[PDB]
Amino acid sequence: TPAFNKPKVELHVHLDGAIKPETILYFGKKRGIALPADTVEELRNIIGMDKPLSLPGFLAKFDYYMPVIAGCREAIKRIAYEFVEMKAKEGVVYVEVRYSPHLLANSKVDPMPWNQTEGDVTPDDVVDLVNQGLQEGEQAFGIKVRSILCCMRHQPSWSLEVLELCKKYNQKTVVAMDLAGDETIEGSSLFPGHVEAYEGAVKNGIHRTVHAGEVGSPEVVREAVDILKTERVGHGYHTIEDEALYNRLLKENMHFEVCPWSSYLTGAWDPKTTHAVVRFKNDKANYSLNTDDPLIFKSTLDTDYQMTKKDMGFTEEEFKRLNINAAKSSFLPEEEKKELLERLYREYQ
Numbered sequence: 001t002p003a004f005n006k007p008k009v010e011l012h013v014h015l016d017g018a019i020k021p022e023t024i025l026y027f028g029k030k031r032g033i034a035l036p037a038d039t040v041e042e043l044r045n046i047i048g049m050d051k052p053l054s055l056p057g058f059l060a061k062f063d064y065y066m067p068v069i070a071g072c073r074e075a076i077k078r079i080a081y082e083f084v085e086m087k088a089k090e091g092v093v094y095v096e097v098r099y100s101p102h103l104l105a106n107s108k109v110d111p112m113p114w115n116q117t118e119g120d121v122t123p124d125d126v127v128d129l130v131n132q133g134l135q136e137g138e139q140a141f142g143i144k145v146r147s148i149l150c151c152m153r154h155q156p157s158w159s160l161e162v163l164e165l166c167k168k169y170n171q172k173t174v175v176a177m178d179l180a181g182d183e184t185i186e187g188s189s190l191f192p193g194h195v196e197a198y199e200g201a202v203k204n205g206i207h208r209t210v211h212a213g214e215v216g217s218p219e220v221v222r223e224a225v226d227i228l229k230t231e232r233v234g235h236g237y238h239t240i241e242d243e244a245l246y247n248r249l250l251k252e253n254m255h256f257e258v259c260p261w262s263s264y265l266t267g268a269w270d271p272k273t274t275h276a277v278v279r280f281k282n283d284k285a286n287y288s289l290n291t292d293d294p295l296i297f298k299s300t301l302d303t304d305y306q307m308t309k310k311d312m313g314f315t316e317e318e319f320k321r322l323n324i325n326a327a328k329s330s331f332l333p334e335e336e337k338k339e340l341l342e343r344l345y346r347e348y349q
């Protein structure tokens with residue numbers, strides 16, 4: 001009984017936030033790097049969350065395992081290949097994964113992440129590796145998968161390189177650019193590196209998406225929409241607080257990448273108030289359901305579909321409708337996007 005047993009489309013899910021607990025254990029032992037636990041079960045409880053934390057508290061979880069992956073080509077390519085497999089079983093036909101290429105490299109990276117020792121896995125080298133694994137998984141499982149490179153809010157200096165990686169791997173799995181990281185950092189959406197990269201994304205034709213409103217105020221969403229020029233808004237829950245900006249985003253048809261379970265676990269959604277998605281459903285807004293970081297939220301695309309069905313009262317029509325919108329809002333090229341839409345309709349009949 002999986003709430004929605006039909007093809008699906010996921011526009012918001014981090015790759016480094018969706019790794020099997022078994023592969024983390026495998027590379028921790030093979031590299032001799034420590035892990036908080038030596039059992040996928042105990043490793044699932046240390047890395048996972050059961051109750052709400054905060055954006056900066058949940059982001060630390062990564063410190064536990066990113067060092068086991070970062071720097072290893074074999075691991076980077078493997079996690080990308082298994083990610084597809086995961087989404088293939090979930091009944092997802094098209095996905096757009098997002099990850100920071102700089103956080104997985106150990107060479108040519110401004111501030112070395114995870115106290116690594118210089119190596120040869122460059123950032124350009126990780127977009128390639130992830131492209132290979134994603135492509136293999138595509139031939140092996142049968143689902144389309146494209147990627148989205150992220151700009152980290154705290155590291156603006158990296159931003160322009162992310163833009164160059166996007167231009168270089170355009171369509172070669174890379175279809176867009178994103179701005180993730182700690183949203184609580186004041187004025188991070190305005191740092192010049194980010195602003196400049198997005199200005200370059202607008203003139204070079206690189207799609208854009210921006211994590212905003214997940215935990216910040218409406219001003220942040222307003223900056224992602226007017227100054228950064230997003231085409232999609234990651235989360236955008238708090239947007240409803242500024243009635244004017246919300247009704248205008250509802251008019252332009254802005255797409256809101258929603259992640260329900262994740263908003264409860266990061267604290268982006270007070271469980272006493274009505275979830276912004278309920279208002280997105282009642283207003284017939286353009287939005288998709290996503291998983292964000294299944295490994296840390298101990299979830300699966302189904303989790304989110306069950307959470308909206310049981311609470312919030314979501315029906316199957318709404319599930320087929322928000323998925324058709326996600327396919328329309330995807331960053332696929334027209335031709336491929338048409339095929340995607342041709343597929344869901346045939347399967348939704």
Ligand SMILES: Nc1ccnc2c1ncn2[C@@H]1O[C@H](CO)[C@@H](O)[C@H]1O
Pocket residue numbers: 014015016017059062098099100103150180181182183211214262266292293
């Ligand atoms: N829920 C989230 C909010 C902001 N940033 C996130 C979230 N999930 C993952 N990220 C960040 O995006 C990076 C790339 O996936 C991760 O290393 C993590 O830092």
Ligand SMILES: [Zn+2]
Pocket residue numbers: 012013014180211234292
């Ligand atoms: Zn996210």
